[PDB]
C-alpha cells in the first residue's frame, strides 16, 4: 500500500517504517494532491493524525481542488481531529470550490459535536456556502434541530456578556 | 484493500 492508503487505513506501524528517514515525504502529495494527513484525517484515524502532526506534518496544504484535512474531518464529524488540527492553527474558515467551510460540511453532515467544537473556537456563521446557504439555513431548511440549537446557543453568547 | 476518499457534501437540499 502507498502511504497514502497506509495512512487512510490506520496502518501507523507501516507508516512509522516508510517514513523512517524523516525528510520531507510526510507532505508527499498523491495524484490529487492529498497528504496521508488529508487521508488519515478524512478517516477518522486518530492516532494516525497525533503521530503524523507530532512528526511536523503541514496541516495547512489543500489538495488540487482545495480539499482540506480540516473539512475532510470536519464532513465526516471527526471532532477530537477536527480539534487537533485547529490546535496548530490551520485555518478554521477554509474555503473549497465545492462551495463550503468546516463548518458548513459539519452542519450538512448533521455533526452537533463537530459544530459545537467549531464553534467554539470561533468559526465564522456568516460565511454562506456558493450554494447560498448560510450554516443556520442549511440546519433550519435540514431540520437538524439539535444543530439549530448549538448555533443558537453560540449567537446567545457572541452578544452577551 | 484501497480505501475511497469520501467527498466533500454538496451544501445545497439535494438528496436531503
Given at each position: ?43 477518522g484515524?486518530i492516532?494516525?493524525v ?23 474531518a470536519?464532513?465526516?464529524?471527526y471532532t477530537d481531529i477536527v480539534g487537533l ?28 459535536k463537530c459544530?459545537?467544537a ?44 | ?16
Amino acid at each position: 500500500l502507498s502511504i497514502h492508503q497506509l495512512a487512510a487505513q490506520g496502518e501507523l506501524d507501516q507508516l512509522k517504517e516508510h517514513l523512517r528517514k524523516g525528510d520531507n515525504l510526510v507532505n508527499k502529495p498523491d495524484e490529487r494532491g492529498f497528504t496521508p494527513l488529508i487521508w488519515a484525517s478524512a478517516f477518522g484515524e486518530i492516532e494516525t493524525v497525533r503521530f503524523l502532526l507530532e512528526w511536523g506534518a503541514d496541516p495547512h496544504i489543500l489538495a488540487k481542488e482545495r480539499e482540506s484535512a480540516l473539512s475532510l474531518a470536519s464532513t465526516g464529524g471527526y471532532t477530537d481531529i477536527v480539534g487537533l488540527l485547529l490546535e496548530r492553527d490551520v485555518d478554521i474558515n477554509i474555503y473549497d470550490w465545492n462551495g463550503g467551510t468546516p463548518l458548513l460540511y459539519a452542519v450538512r453532515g448533521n455533526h452537533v459535536k463537530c459544530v459545537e467544537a467549531l464553534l467554539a473556537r470561533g468559526a465564522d456563521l456568516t460565511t454562506e456556502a456558493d450554494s447560498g446557504y448560510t450554516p443556520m439555513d442549511l440546519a433550519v431548511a435540514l431540520g437538524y434541530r439539535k444543530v439549530q440549537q448549538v448555533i443558537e446557543n453560540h449567537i446567545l453568547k457572541l452578544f452577551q456578556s | 484493500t484501497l480505501v475511497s476518499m469520501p467527498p466533500l457534501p454538496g451544501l445545497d437540499l439535494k438528496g436531503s
